[PDB]
Amino acid sequence: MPNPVRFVYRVDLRSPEEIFEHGFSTLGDVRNFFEHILSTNFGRSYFISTSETPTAAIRFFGSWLREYVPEHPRRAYLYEIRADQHFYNARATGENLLDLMRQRQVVFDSGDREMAQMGIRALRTSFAYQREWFTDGPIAAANVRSAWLVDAVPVEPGHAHHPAGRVVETTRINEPEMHNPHYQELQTQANDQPWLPTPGIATPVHLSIPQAASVADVSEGTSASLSFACPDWSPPNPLDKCIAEKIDNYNLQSLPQYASSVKELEDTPVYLRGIKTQKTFMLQADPQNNNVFLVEVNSSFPQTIFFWDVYQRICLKDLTGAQISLSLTAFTTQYAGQLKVHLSVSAVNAVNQKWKMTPQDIAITQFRVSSELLGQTENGLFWNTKSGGSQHDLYVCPLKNPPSDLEELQIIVDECTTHAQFVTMRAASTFFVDVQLGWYWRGYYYTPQLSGWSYQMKTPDGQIFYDLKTSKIFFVQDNQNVFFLHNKLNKQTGYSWDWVEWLKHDMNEDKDENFKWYFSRDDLTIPSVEGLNFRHIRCYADNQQLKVIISGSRWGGWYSTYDKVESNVEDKILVKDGFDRF
């Protein structure tokens, strides 16, 4: 409740005159979670889609055009909607269902667990960037606070080349904001629980898993559900009103990670220009020391190719030797209103790795790059015009009253500089969640050590991750050394428990269930009385449970066990707030 989801967002072609008066209506009367996520036989869902951020709500709307003269410029409205108890998070709902399936508490009315896990994999990876909160039914006019006219426009029109024959588009949120006079300020928040169709004890959860899915291709390999891409779908060709390059249908076992438009991707260096000095720089970064810096145009090496993905991250193209991806990250300094940019492990839930790129000129060629860390405060990238040497540091500052010698840098798009697709959000290539695992005892925080013991301190950001592709948990010692959480316990161990261990391992390996883990809410109080976020953690292999020894000579020792109840042990693991939503 200190950190609720208060507003969600939705792009819809219907005008505020209609929405401000009537709210949003459902497609149909079917309350089926998987069919809604997978757009199965689209057009019957009782659920209405919204997104936790404007950027995610509007992504589909930036789909690239075919090479023809657009006779109907693309316009719609972004709505800001107060969330309440009938708004549920799609990702968290899916994780809860995975938990129930692994613990064997599901009745499959249709389909099976293998199929459901394919559905969950798609939700975790392909559709996750949507940041979807769905409503269990209609949204009243009284929830809708504001609207903005939005449009999609080509980047550098008349000049930009068309990757694979498609025209690079971006979106704009136009001022001014329009306020809904029927809006009621009720100080509510989205439901913090995973969705289930029935009340109270739902325990024997019944699931109907569909055999097929539909996916809108929204450019650069990106998948969108039809509930996002066809916001005003009508019964009969409705698909013609969808905003997307194309709609594909697949059997669930055939569902690809990327859309056909993935062929549009090109390697792009990044060029920035100082607003006053007009000096031009290339963005560069070095995974050996995680430095990010600027080199003026006029035993490691700088890397030069970046992309901006649908999680809003600006990532270096290549993985390190230990198979991790690195992203530009805005870190706090000691100075008033001056963040410094540096690399860290790409994480889908790290707000300090999220960036917006907004066109500043009507020719759509100059782009301000802003950090989501600074919230509603207008901000941009800066360099120190007085700094000397070959490489210059990169900062983020509020636009208002910037430090003395600093000037803003904006991305410039041109044949001789940044290519147009850089300033659009392409499909993501890694799906790591920062889970920051730890434990808590009597006011003190503890963190895992690679030895299997614990150290007394709070787990730092950017260290312990969960790979959504494979369900592995890993600890990044540094860019070349990554260790994975491994279960040793089985039905032949002779004992009811065994230590866990941290081992180097192939990030891509996806079969061995002793490296696979999932989170469980069970009967935990969430959040805890003191505001903490706890989960139980179990291994896919045979539901062996992760725990930590509390006291004695083996205090701080991490192990797994078949025993649900034990003494002198902690089964509540700390996990970063919001880890199950991104």
Side-chain angles (χ1 to χ4, degrees), residues 465-497:
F465 298 88
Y466 184 76
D467 173 29
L468 291 166
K469 286 179 84 175
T470 63
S471 301
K472 300 196 292 294
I473 287 168
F474 64 91
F475 184 122
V476 178
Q477 177 177 76
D478 60 35
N479 288 342
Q480 287 74 231
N481 292 283
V482 176
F483 301 81
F484 296 80
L485 181 61
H486 182 240
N487 166 73
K488 297 167 66 162
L489 177 70
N490 60 47
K491 272 164 295 202
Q492 296 81 44
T493 288
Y495 303 84
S496 64
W497 69 279

PDB file of all heavy atoms in Angstrom, residues 465-497:
ATOM      1  N   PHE A 465      19.701 -12.983  -9.847  1.00  0.00           N
ATOM      2  CA  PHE A 465      18.724 -12.873 -10.919  1.00  0.00           C
ATOM      3  C   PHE A 465      17.971 -14.159 -11.148  1.00  0.00           C
ATOM      4  O   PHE A 465      18.429 -15.244 -10.795  1.00  0.00           O
ATOM      5  CB  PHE A 465      19.435 -12.534 -12.231  1.00  0.00           C
ATOM      6  CG  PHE A 465      20.157 -11.221 -12.207  1.00  0.00           C
ATOM      7  CD1 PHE A 465      21.467 -11.152 -11.755  1.00  0.00           C
ATOM      8  CD2 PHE A 465      19.537 -10.059 -12.649  1.00  0.00           C
ATOM      9  CE1 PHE A 465      22.153  -9.958 -11.744  1.00  0.00           C
ATOM     10  CE2 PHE A 465      20.225  -8.852 -12.636  1.00  0.00           C
ATOM     11  CZ  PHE A 465      21.546  -8.812 -12.186  1.00  0.00           C
ATOM     12  N   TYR A 466      16.800 -14.023 -11.762  1.00  0.00           N
ATOM     13  CA  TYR A 466      16.025 -15.170 -12.191  1.00  0.00           C
ATOM     14  C   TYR A 466      15.843 -15.063 -13.696  1.00  0.00           C
ATOM     15  O   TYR A 466      15.381 -14.033 -14.187  1.00  0.00           O
ATOM     16  CB  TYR A 466      14.682 -15.127 -11.479  1.00  0.00           C
ATOM     17  CG  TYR A 466      13.745 -16.296 -11.718  1.00  0.00           C
ATOM     18  CD1 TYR A 466      13.958 -17.527 -11.113  1.00  0.00           C
ATOM     19  CD2 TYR A 466      12.603 -16.140 -12.480  1.00  0.00           C
ATOM     20  CE1 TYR A 466      13.066 -18.590 -11.297  1.00  0.00           C
ATOM     21  CE2 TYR A 466      11.706 -17.186 -12.663  1.00  0.00           C
ATOM     22  CZ  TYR A 466      11.940 -18.412 -12.067  1.00  0.00           C
ATOM     23  OH  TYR A 466      11.024 -19.434 -12.254  1.00  0.00           O
ATOM     24  N   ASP A 467      16.242 -16.098 -14.429  1.00  0.00           N
ATOM     25  CA  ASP A 467      16.102 -16.091 -15.886  1.00  0.00           C
ATOM     26  C   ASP A 467      14.729 -16.606 -16.266  1.00  0.00           C
ATOM     27  O   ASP A 467      14.450 -17.790 -16.122  1.00  0.00           O
ATOM     28  CB  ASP A 467      17.156 -16.966 -16.557  1.00  0.00           C
ATOM     29  CG  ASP A 467      16.911 -17.103 -18.046  1.00  0.00           C
ATOM     30  OD1 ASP A 467      16.336 -16.161 -18.650  1.00  0.00           O
ATOM     31  OD2 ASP A 467      17.248 -18.162 -18.603  1.00  0.00           O
ATOM     32  N   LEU A 468      13.866 -15.719 -16.754  1.00  0.00           N
ATOM     33  CA  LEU A 468      12.497 -16.119 -17.091  1.00  0.00           C
ATOM     34  C   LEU A 468      12.421 -17.128 -18.234  1.00  0.00           C
ATOM     35  O   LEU A 468      11.417 -17.820 -18.375  1.00  0.00           O
ATOM     36  CB  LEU A 468      11.661 -14.885 -17.439  1.00  0.00           C
ATOM     37  CG  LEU A 468      11.363 -13.959 -16.258  1.00  0.00           C
ATOM     38  CD1 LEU A 468      10.829 -12.614 -16.779  1.00  0.00           C
ATOM     39  CD2 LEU A 468      10.377 -14.610 -15.254  1.00  0.00           C
ATOM     40  N   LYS A 469      13.448 -17.190 -19.084  1.00  0.00           N
ATOM     41  CA  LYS A 469      13.405 -18.161 -20.182  1.00  0.00           C
ATOM     42  C   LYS A 469      13.489 -19.600 -19.680  1.00  0.00           C
ATOM     43  O   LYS A 469      12.839 -20.485 -20.217  1.00  0.00           O
ATOM     44  CB  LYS A 469      14.536 -17.934 -21.196  1.00  0.00           C
ATOM     45  CG  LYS A 469      14.363 -16.728 -22.097  1.00  0.00           C
ATOM     46  CD  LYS A 469      15.568 -16.576 -23.056  1.00  0.00           C
ATOM     47  CE  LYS A 469      15.414 -17.434 -24.294  1.00  0.00           C
ATOM     48  NZ  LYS A 469      16.518 -17.186 -25.282  1.00  0.00           N
ATOM     49  N   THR A 470      14.305 -19.823 -18.660  1.00  0.00           N
ATOM     50  CA  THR A 470      14.670 -21.177 -18.246  1.00  0.00           C
ATOM     51  C   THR A 470      14.355 -21.495 -16.784  1.00  0.00           C
ATOM     52  O   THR A 470      14.533 -22.629 -16.369  1.00  0.00           O
ATOM     53  CB  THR A 470      16.174 -21.438 -18.441  1.00  0.00           C
ATOM     54  OG1 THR A 470      16.924 -20.544 -17.610  1.00  0.00           O
ATOM     55  CG2 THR A 470      16.593 -21.250 -19.917  1.00  0.00           C
ATOM     56  N   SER A 471      13.904 -20.498 -16.024  1.00  0.00           N
ATOM     57  CA  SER A 471      13.627 -20.633 -14.585  1.00  0.00           C
ATOM     58  C   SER A 471      14.861 -20.908 -13.722  1.00  0.00           C
ATOM     59  O   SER A 471      14.735 -21.445 -12.621  1.00  0.00           O
ATOM     60  CB  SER A 471      12.561 -21.717 -14.316  1.00  0.00           C
ATOM     61  OG  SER A 471      11.331 -21.425 -14.967  1.00  0.00           O
ATOM     62  N   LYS A 472      16.048 -20.549 -14.203  1.00  0.00           N
ATOM     63  CA  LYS A 472      17.254 -20.704 -13.390  1.00  0.00           C
ATOM     64  C   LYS A 472      17.495 -19.461 -12.523  1.00  0.00           C
ATOM     65  O   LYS A 472      17.012 -18.356 -12.832  1.00  0.00           O
ATOM     66  CB  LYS A 472      18.477 -21.025 -14.271  1.00  0.00           C
ATOM     67  CG  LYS A 472      18.342 -22.317 -15.082  1.00  0.00           C
ATOM     68  CD  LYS A 472      19.692 -22.795 -15.613  1.00  0.00           C
ATOM     69  CE  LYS A 472      20.230 -21.837 -16.664  1.00  0.00           C
ATOM     70  NZ  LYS A 472      19.349 -21.877 -17.863  1.00  0.00           N
ATOM     71  N   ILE A 473      18.191 -19.650 -11.409  1.00  0.00           N
ATOM     72  CA  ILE A 473      18.564 -18.546 -10.539  1.00  0.00           C
ATOM     73  C   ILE A 473      20.078 -18.413 -10.585  1.00  0.00           C
ATOM     74  O   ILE A 473      20.787 -19.412 -10.452  1.00  0.00           O
ATOM     75  CB  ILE A 473      18.101 -18.793  -9.092  1.00  0.00           C
ATOM     76  CG1 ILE A 473      16.578 -18.621  -9.019  1.00  0.00           C
ATOM     77  CG2 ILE A 473      18.766 -17.821  -8.116  1.00  0.00           C
ATOM     78  CD1 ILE A 473      15.955 -19.108  -7.714  1.00  0.00           C
ATOM     79  N   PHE A 474      20.574 -17.191 -10.771  1.00  0.00           N
ATOM     80  CA  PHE A 474      22.022 -17.001 -10.883  1.00  0.00           C
ATOM     81  C   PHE A 474      22.558 -15.791 -10.123  1.00  0.00           C
ATOM     82  O   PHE A 474      21.837 -14.825  -9.850  1.00  0.00           O
ATOM     83  CB  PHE A 474      22.491 -17.039 -12.355  1.00  0.00           C
ATOM     84  CG  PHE A 474      21.945 -15.919 -13.231  1.00  0.00           C
ATOM     85  CD1 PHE A 474      22.640 -14.721 -13.369  1.00  0.00           C
ATOM     86  CD2 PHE A 474      20.769 -16.084 -13.951  1.00  0.00           C
ATOM     87  CE1 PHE A 474      22.172 -13.706 -14.198  1.00  0.00           C
ATOM     88  CE2 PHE A 474      20.282 -15.052 -14.786  1.00  0.00           C
ATOM     89  CZ  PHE A 474      20.990 -13.878 -14.912  1.00  0.00           C
ATOM     90  N   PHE A 475      23.838 -15.877  -9.775  1.00  0.00           N
ATOM     91  CA  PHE A 475      24.546 -14.894  -8.968  1.00  0.00           C
ATOM     92  C   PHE A 475      25.673 -14.387  -9.866  1.00  0.00           C
ATOM     93  O   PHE A 475      26.493 -15.173 -10.333  1.00  0.00           O
ATOM     94  CB  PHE A 475      25.127 -15.626  -7.744  1.00  0.00           C
ATOM     95  CG  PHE A 475      25.828 -14.751  -6.743  1.00  0.00           C
ATOM     96  CD1 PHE A 475      25.396 -14.726  -5.414  1.00  0.00           C
ATOM     97  CD2 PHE A 475      26.971 -14.039  -7.081  1.00  0.00           C
ATOM     98  CE1 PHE A 475      26.056 -13.958  -4.456  1.00  0.00           C
ATOM     99  CE2 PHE A 475      27.638 -13.257  -6.127  1.00  0.00           C
ATOM    100  CZ  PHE A 475      27.179 -13.216  -4.815  1.00  0.00           C
ATOM    101  N   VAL A 476      25.708 -13.086 -10.127  1.00  0.00           N
ATOM    102  CA  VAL A 476      26.743 -12.527 -10.987  1.00  0.00           C
ATOM    103  C   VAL A 476      27.874 -11.996 -10.120  1.00  0.00           C
ATOM    104  O   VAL A 476      27.732 -10.979  -9.457  1.00  0.00           O
ATOM    105  CB  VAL A 476      26.212 -11.390 -11.891  1.00  0.00           C
ATOM    106  CG1 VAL A 476      27.338 -10.802 -12.747  1.00  0.00           C
ATOM    107  CG2 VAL A 476      25.065 -11.899 -12.780  1.00  0.00           C
ATOM    108  N   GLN A 477      28.987 -12.722 -10.108  1.00  0.00           N
ATOM    109  CA  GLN A 477      30.173 -12.287  -9.387  1.00  0.00           C
ATOM    110  C   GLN A 477      30.792 -11.122 -10.146  1.00  0.00           C
ATOM    111  O   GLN A 477      31.173 -10.109  -9.569  1.00  0.00           O
ATOM    112  CB  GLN A 477      31.178 -13.435  -9.296  1.00  0.00           C
ATOM    113  CG  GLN A 477      32.483 -13.064  -8.628  1.00  0.00           C
ATOM    114  CD  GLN A 477      33.413 -14.264  -8.495  1.00  0.00           C
ATOM    115  OE1 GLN A 477      34.027 -14.705  -9.467  1.00  0.00           O
ATOM    116  NE2 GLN A 477      33.508 -14.801  -7.288  1.00  0.00           N
ATOM    117  N   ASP A 478      30.895 -11.294 -11.456  1.00  0.00           N
ATOM    118  CA  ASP A 478      31.253 -10.209 -12.350  1.00  0.00           C
ATOM    119  C   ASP A 478      30.890 -10.623 -13.766  1.00  0.00           C
ATOM    120  O   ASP A 478      30.302 -11.685 -13.981  1.00  0.00           O
ATOM    121  CB  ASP A 478      32.739  -9.835 -12.236  1.00  0.00           C
ATOM    122  CG  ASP A 478      33.675 -10.991 -12.572  1.00  0.00           C
ATOM    123  OD1 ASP A 478      33.360 -11.818 -13.452  1.00  0.00           O
ATOM    124  OD2 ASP A 478      34.758 -11.057 -11.951  1.00  0.00           O
ATOM    125  N   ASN A 479      31.236  -9.792 -14.734  1.00  0.00           N
ATOM    126  CA  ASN A 479      30.813 -10.049 -16.107  1.00  0.00           C
ATOM    127  C   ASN A 479      31.310 -11.366 -16.714  1.00  0.00           C
ATOM    128  O   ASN A 479      30.706 -11.868 -17.653  1.00  0.00           O
ATOM    129  CB  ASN A 479      31.162  -8.863 -17.014  1.00  0.00           C
ATOM    130  CG  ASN A 479      30.270  -7.652 -16.755  1.00  0.00           C
ATOM    131  OD1 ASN A 479      29.147  -7.881 -16.113  1.00  0.00           O
ATOM    132  ND2 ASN A 479      30.595  -6.527 -17.135  1.00  0.00           N
ATOM    133  N   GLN A 480      32.393 -11.931 -16.183  1.00  0.00           N
ATOM    134  CA  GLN A 480      32.925 -13.189 -16.714  1.00  0.00           C
ATOM    135  C   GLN A 480      32.711 -14.391 -15.789  1.00  0.00           C
ATOM    136  O   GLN A 480      33.188 -15.481 -16.079  1.00  0.00           O
ATOM    137  CB  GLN A 480      34.424 -13.066 -17.033  1.00  0.00           C
ATOM    138  CG  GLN A 480      34.739 -12.232 -18.271  1.00  0.00           C
ATOM    139  CD  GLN A 480      34.546 -10.757 -18.034  1.00  0.00           C
ATOM    140  OE1 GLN A 480      33.874 -10.075 -18.807  1.00  0.00           O
ATOM    141  NE2 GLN A 480      35.137 -10.250 -16.954  1.00  0.00           N
ATOM    142  N   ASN A 481      32.013 -14.194 -14.673  1.00  0.00           N
ATOM    143  CA  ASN A 481      31.847 -15.264 -13.701  1.00  0.00           C
ATOM    144  C   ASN A 481      30.426 -15.272 -13.148  1.00  0.00           C
ATOM    145  O   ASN A 481      30.074 -14.422 -12.339  1.00  0.00           O
ATOM    146  CB  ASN A 481      32.859 -15.098 -12.569  1.00  0.00           C
ATOM    147  CG  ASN A 481      34.295 -15.322 -13.034  1.00  0.00           C
ATOM    148  OD1 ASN A 481      34.723 -16.460 -13.218  1.00  0.00           O
ATOM    149  ND2 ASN A 481      35.036 -14.234 -13.242  1.00  0.00           N
ATOM    150  N   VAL A 482      29.626 -16.238 -13.599  1.00  0.00           N
ATOM    151  CA  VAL A 482      28.217 -16.340 -13.213  1.00  0.00           C
ATOM    152  C   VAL A 482      27.941 -17.733 -12.645  1.00  0.00           C
ATOM    153  O   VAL A 482      28.346 -18.738 -13.236  1.00  0.00           O
ATOM    154  CB  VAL A 482      27.303 -16.058 -14.429  1.00  0.00           C
ATOM    155  CG1 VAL A 482      25.821 -16.265 -14.070  1.00  0.00           C
ATOM    156  CG2 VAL A 482      27.527 -14.628 -14.949  1.00  0.00           C
ATOM    157  N   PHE A 483      27.258 -17.788 -11.495  1.00  0.00           N
ATOM    158  CA  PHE A 483      27.000 -19.053 -10.802  1.00  0.00           C
ATOM    159  C   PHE A 483      25.511 -19.297 -10.606  1.00  0.00           C
ATOM    160  O   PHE A 483      24.786 -18.377 -10.220  1.00  0.00           O
ATOM    161  CB  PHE A 483      27.689 -19.050  -9.432  1.00  0.00           C
ATOM    162  CG  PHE A 483      29.180 -18.873  -9.514  1.00  0.00           C
ATOM    163  CD1 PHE A 483      29.731 -17.609  -9.678  1.00  0.00           C
ATOM    164  CD2 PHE A 483      30.024 -19.966  -9.446  1.00  0.00           C
ATOM    165  CE1 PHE A 483      31.100 -17.442  -9.749  1.00  0.00           C
ATOM    166  CE2 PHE A 483      31.398 -19.804  -9.533  1.00  0.00           C
ATOM    167  CZ  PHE A 483      31.932 -18.544  -9.691  1.00  0.00           C
ATOM    168  N   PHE A 484      25.085 -20.541 -10.822  1.00  0.00           N
ATOM    169  CA  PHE A 484      23.668 -20.926 -10.816  1.00  0.00           C
ATOM    170  C   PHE A 484      23.288 -21.803  -9.619  1.00  0.00           C
ATOM    171  O   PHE A 484      24.048 -22.695  -9.211  1.00  0.00           O
ATOM    172  CB  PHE A 484      23.342 -21.671 -12.106  1.00  0.00           C
ATOM    173  CG  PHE A 484      23.484 -20.820 -13.344  1.00  0.00           C
ATOM    174  CD1 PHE A 484      24.733 -20.590 -13.911  1.00  0.00           C
ATOM    175  CD2 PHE A 484      22.371 -20.228 -13.916  1.00  0.00           C
ATOM    176  CE1 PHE A 484      24.859 -19.793 -15.053  1.00  0.00           C
ATOM    177  CE2 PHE A 484      22.485 -19.427 -15.047  1.00  0.00           C
ATOM    178  CZ  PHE A 484      23.732 -19.213 -15.621  1.00  0.00           C
ATOM    179  N   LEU A 485      22.102 -21.557  -9.080  1.00  0.00           N
ATOM    180  CA  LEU A 485      21.628 -22.245  -7.882  1.00  0.00           C
ATOM    181  C   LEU A 485      21.237 -23.659  -8.257  1.00  0.00           C
ATOM    182  O   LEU A 485      20.415 -23.871  -9.154  1.00  0.00           O
ATOM    183  CB  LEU A 485      20.431 -21.489  -7.277  1.00  0.00           C
ATOM    184  CG  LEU A 485      19.839 -22.075  -5.983  1.00  0.00           C
ATOM    185  CD1 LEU A 485      20.899 -22.078  -4.883  1.00  0.00           C
ATOM    186  CD2 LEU A 485      18.624 -21.298  -5.548  1.00  0.00           C
ATOM    187  N   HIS A 486      21.850 -24.639  -7.593  1.00  0.00           N
ATOM    188  CA  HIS A 486      21.672 -26.037  -7.962  1.00  0.00           C
ATOM    189  C   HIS A 486      21.161 -26.900  -6.799  1.00  0.00           C
ATOM    190  O   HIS A 486      21.737 -26.896  -5.706  1.00  0.00           O
ATOM    191  CB  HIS A 486      22.997 -26.615  -8.492  1.00  0.00           C
ATOM    192  CG  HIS A 486      22.901 -28.038  -8.946  1.00  0.00           C
ATOM    193  ND1 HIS A 486      23.643 -29.050  -8.378  1.00  0.00           N
ATOM    194  CD2 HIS A 486      22.147 -28.621  -9.909  1.00  0.00           C
ATOM    195  CE1 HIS A 486      23.358 -30.195  -8.974  1.00  0.00           C
ATOM    196  NE2 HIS A 486      22.452 -29.963  -9.907  1.00  0.00           N
ATOM    197  N   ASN A 487      20.095 -27.655  -7.050  1.00  0.00           N
ATOM    198  CA  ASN A 487      19.548 -28.560  -6.043  1.00  0.00           C
ATOM    199  C   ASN A 487      20.323 -29.872  -6.079  1.00  0.00           C
ATOM    200  O   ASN A 487      20.663 -30.334  -7.149  1.00  0.00           O
ATOM    201  CB  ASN A 487      18.074 -28.838  -6.332  1.00  0.00           C
ATOM    202  CG  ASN A 487      17.531 -30.018  -5.530  1.00  0.00           C
ATOM    203  OD1 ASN A 487      17.338 -29.806  -4.249  1.00  0.00           O
ATOM    204  ND2 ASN A 487      17.294 -31.106  -6.066  1.00  0.00           N
ATOM    205  N   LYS A 488      20.608 -30.463  -4.921  1.00  0.00           N
ATOM    206  CA  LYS A 488      21.305 -31.765  -4.887  1.00  0.00           C
ATOM    207  C   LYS A 488      20.401 -32.867  -4.331  1.00  0.00           C
ATOM    208  O   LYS A 488      20.617 -34.056  -4.582  1.00  0.00           O
ATOM    209  CB  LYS A 488      22.571 -31.678  -4.036  1.00  0.00           C
ATOM    210  CG  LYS A 488      23.613 -30.717  -4.579  1.00  0.00           C
ATOM    211  CD  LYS A 488      24.698 -30.426  -3.547  1.00  0.00           C
ATOM    212  CE  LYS A 488      25.513 -31.664  -3.229  1.00  0.00           C
ATOM    213  NZ  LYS A 488      26.813 -31.301  -2.577  1.00  0.00           N
ATOM    214  N   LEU A 489      19.394 -32.453  -3.571  1.00  0.00           N
ATOM    215  CA  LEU A 489      18.473 -33.378  -2.908  1.00  0.00           C
ATOM    216  C   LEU A 489      17.595 -34.171  -3.868  1.00  0.00           C
ATOM    217  O   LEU A 489      17.000 -33.616  -4.798  1.00  0.00           O
ATOM    218  CB  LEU A 489      17.574 -32.615  -1.930  1.00  0.00           C
ATOM    219  CG  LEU A 489      16.492 -33.418  -1.193  1.00  0.00           C
ATOM    220  CD1 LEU A 489      17.144 -34.363  -0.174  1.00  0.00           C
ATOM    221  CD2 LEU A 489      15.508 -32.488  -0.497  1.00  0.00           C
ATOM    222  N   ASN A 490      17.497 -35.476  -3.622  1.00  0.00           N
ATOM    223  CA  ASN A 490      16.533 -36.315  -4.326  1.00  0.00           C
ATOM    224  C   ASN A 490      16.061 -37.474  -3.448  1.00  0.00           C
ATOM    225  O   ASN A 490      16.471 -37.589  -2.293  1.00  0.00           O
ATOM    226  CB  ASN A 490      17.117 -36.835  -5.641  1.00  0.00           C
ATOM    227  CG  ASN A 490      18.364 -37.663  -5.432  1.00  0.00           C
ATOM    228  OD1 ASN A 490      18.399 -38.540  -4.571  1.00  0.00           O
ATOM    229  ND2 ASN A 490      19.401 -37.387  -6.219  1.00  0.00           N
ATOM    230  N   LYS A 491      15.200 -38.323  -4.001  1.00  0.00           N
ATOM    231  CA  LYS A 491      14.578 -39.402  -3.231  1.00  0.00           C
ATOM    232  C   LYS A 491      15.554 -40.508  -2.831  1.00  0.00           C
ATOM    233  O   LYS A 491      15.189 -41.424  -2.093  1.00  0.00           O
ATOM    234  CB  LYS A 491      13.377 -39.984  -3.987  1.00  0.00           C
ATOM    235  CG  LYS A 491      12.073 -39.243  -3.706  1.00  0.00           C
ATOM    236  CD  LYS A 491      10.989 -39.565  -4.727  1.00  0.00           C
ATOM    237  CE  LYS A 491      11.373 -39.071  -6.120  1.00  0.00           C
ATOM    238  NZ  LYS A 491      10.188 -38.880  -7.006  1.00  0.00           N
ATOM    239  N   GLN A 492      16.790 -40.415  -3.310  1.00  0.00           N
ATOM    240  CA  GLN A 492      17.820 -41.395  -2.971  1.00  0.00           C
ATOM    241  C   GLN A 492      18.951 -40.798  -2.132  1.00  0.00           C
ATOM    242  O   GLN A 492      19.991 -41.424  -1.956  1.00  0.00           O
ATOM    243  CB  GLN A 492      18.401 -42.033  -4.235  1.00  0.00           C
ATOM    244  CG  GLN A 492      17.399 -42.846  -5.044  1.00  0.00           C
ATOM    245  CD  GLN A 492      16.523 -41.983  -5.939  1.00  0.00           C
ATOM    246  OE1 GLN A 492      17.007 -41.064  -6.605  1.00  0.00           O
ATOM    247  NE2 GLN A 492      15.227 -42.284  -5.969  1.00  0.00           N
ATOM    248  N   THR A 493      18.749 -39.594  -1.609  1.00  0.00           N
ATOM    249  CA  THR A 493      19.795 -38.925  -0.843  1.00  0.00           C
ATOM    250  C   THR A 493      20.042 -39.612   0.503  1.00  0.00           C
ATOM    251  O   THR A 493      21.119 -39.491   1.090  1.00  0.00           O
ATOM    252  CB  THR A 493      19.463 -37.421  -0.634  1.00  0.00           C
ATOM    253  OG1 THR A 493      19.615 -36.722  -1.879  1.00  0.00           O
ATOM    254  CG2 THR A 493      20.381 -36.778   0.409  1.00  0.00           C
ATOM    255  N   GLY A 494      19.045 -40.349   0.980  1.00  0.00           N
ATOM    256  CA  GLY A 494      19.141 -41.005   2.271  1.00  0.00           C
ATOM    257  C   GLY A 494      18.628 -40.105   3.376  1.00  0.00           C
ATOM    258  O   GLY A 494      18.157 -40.581   4.410  1.00  0.00           O
ATOM    259  N   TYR A 495      18.724 -38.797   3.152  1.00  0.00           N
ATOM    260  CA  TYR A 495      18.215 -37.808   4.091  1.00  0.00           C
ATOM    261  C   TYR A 495      17.066 -37.018   3.477  1.00  0.00           C
ATOM    262  O   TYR A 495      16.809 -37.094   2.271  1.00  0.00           O
ATOM    263  CB  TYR A 495      19.311 -36.829   4.505  1.00  0.00           C
ATOM    264  CG  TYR A 495      20.533 -37.473   5.108  1.00  0.00           C
ATOM    265  CD1 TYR A 495      21.541 -37.981   4.301  1.00  0.00           C
ATOM    266  CD2 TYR A 495      20.687 -37.561   6.484  1.00  0.00           C
ATOM    267  CE1 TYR A 495      22.665 -38.567   4.848  1.00  0.00           C
ATOM    268  CE2 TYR A 495      21.806 -38.144   7.040  1.00  0.00           C
ATOM    269  CZ  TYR A 495      22.792 -38.646   6.219  1.00  0.00           C
ATOM    270  OH  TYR A 495      23.910 -39.229   6.767  1.00  0.00           O
ATOM    271  N   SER A 496      16.398 -36.245   4.325  1.00  0.00           N
ATOM    272  CA  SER A 496      15.249 -35.443   3.924  1.00  0.00           C
ATOM    273  C   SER A 496      15.678 -34.093   3.341  1.00  0.00           C
ATOM    274  O   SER A 496      14.853 -33.347   2.804  1.00  0.00           O
ATOM    275  CB  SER A 496      14.341 -35.213   5.136  1.00  0.00           C
ATOM    276  OG  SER A 496      15.016 -34.461   6.130  1.00  0.00           O
ATOM    277  N   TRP A 497      16.965 -33.787   3.462  1.00  0.00           N
ATOM    278  CA  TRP A 497      17.510 -32.506   3.036  1.00  0.00           C
ATOM    279  C   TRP A 497      18.926 -32.663   2.488  1.00  0.00           C
ATOM    280  O   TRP A 497      19.575 -33.694   2.692  1.00  0.00           O
ATOM    281  CB  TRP A 497      17.535 -31.539   4.214  1.00  0.00           C
ATOM    282  CG  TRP A 497      18.527 -31.919   5.268  1.00  0.00           C
ATOM    283  CD1 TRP A 497      18.362 -32.849   6.256  1.00  0.00           C
ATOM    284  CD2 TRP A 497      19.841 -31.380   5.440  1.00  0.00           C
ATOM    285  NE1 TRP A 497      19.492 -32.917   7.039  1.00  0.00           N
ATOM    286  CE2 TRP A 497      20.418 -32.025   6.555  1.00  0.00           C
ATOM    287  CE3 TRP A 497      20.588 -30.413   4.758  1.00  0.00           C
ATOM    288  CZ2 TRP A 497      21.704 -31.733   7.005  1.00  0.00           C
ATOM    289  CZ3 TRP A 497      21.865 -30.124   5.202  1.00  0.00           C
ATOM    290  CH2 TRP A 497      22.411 -30.782   6.316  1.00  0.00           C
TER     291      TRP A 497
END
